[PDB]
Amino acid sequence: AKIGLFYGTQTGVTQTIAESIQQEFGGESIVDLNDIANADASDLNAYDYLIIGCPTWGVGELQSDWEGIYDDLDSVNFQGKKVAYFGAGDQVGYSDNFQDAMGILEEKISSLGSQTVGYWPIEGYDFNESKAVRNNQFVGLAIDEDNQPDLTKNRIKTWVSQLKSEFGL
Ligand SMILES: Cc1cc2nc3c(=O)[nH]c(=O)nc-3n(C[C@H](O)[C@H](O)[C@H](O)COP(=O)(O)O)c2cc1C
């Protein structure tokens, strides 16, 4: 597929969101799903369009599989590649670290010559601080199954429509 989606998950939510995103794009012919736990950093080189999914755990920390491959990211060819991001978080229980993991990954990957695409509005959420927020907007899709599960389906629909316009679809 032209789009490679790499996700990490601890309690399965980010994987379910990833599957939904793949479905919304049109399925396997359009988006390849890859669990970062079973990947080598070089696997990301096979795609020119990437989607990076990761939930936040601990206190604003990267999900363990992403944490484990983080130091290898600088060896990947991200030069001129368009990269989108999504994450699962809990804005009520972790208002000061909402979606910090997505922010950490974008901050690292965007510093490696890539182009972040898929910015998302912060207005549909209530939180205090987030490393995923730059210039008053999220660096990618923020999903909250703990507090806003009813909004997930339409958020994904909206975001994917937005991304197609930015991914050549
Ligand atoms: C112990 C614990 C720590 C968490 N830490 C954070 C955090 O710092 N920020 C946040 O946005 N959500 C945090 N969450 C919420 C998770 O990101 C959320 O439940 C998400 O759906 C988990 O996704 P996953 O199932 O893909 O692992 C935490 C939840 C728990 C139970």
Side-chain angles (χ1 to χ4, degrees), residues 14-158:
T14 302
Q15 174 175 336
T16 295
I17 297 167
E19 286 158 346
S20 291
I21 287 169
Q22 177 185 53
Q23 181 190 335
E24 193 61 28
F25 265 101
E28 296 181 29
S29 67
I30 308 304
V31 177
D32 279 337
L33 238 45
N34 299 279
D35 187 331
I36 202 67
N38 308 325
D40 283 320
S42 57
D43 291 346
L44 282 68
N45 287 337
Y47 308 90
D48 283 337
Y49 302 125
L50 295 164
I51 296 180
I52 304 294
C54 182
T56 305
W57 282 91
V59 188
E61 297 165 83
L62 290 175
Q63 181 273 336
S64 69
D65 293 308
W66 271 115
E67 179 55 62
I69 201 175
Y70 183 86
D71 286 334
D72 286 337
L73 292 171
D74 57 15
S75 70
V76 179
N77 181 17
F78 289 113
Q79 190 62 216
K81 288 191 180 174
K82 287 184 178 182
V83 186
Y85 302 81
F86 69 96
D90 173 8
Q91 70 201 266
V92 179
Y94 302 83
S95 195
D96 300 319
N97 305 93
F98 186 48
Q99 305 285 352
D100 277 5
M102 166 162 66
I104 295 172
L105 290 179
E106 190 275 345
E107 212 259 79
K108 160 61 70 171
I109 293 173
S110 65
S111 78
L112 296 174
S114 62
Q115 182 195 342
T116 300
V117 296
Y119 289 90
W120 192 251
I122 66 163
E123 287 76 6
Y125 310 78
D126 183 28
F127 64 97
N128 303 140
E129 299 290 306
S130 173
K131 288 184 174 179
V133 174
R134 294 188 184 220
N135 308 326
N136 196 76
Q137 63 180 359
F138 278 121
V139 296
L141 180 61
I143 294 301
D144 184 344
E145 279 297 320
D146 296 317
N147 308 110
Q148 298 175 316
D150 292 351
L151 300 182
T152 300
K153 184 183 182 187
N154 207 55
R155 286 182 157 155
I156 296 176
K157 179 182 163 296
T158 299

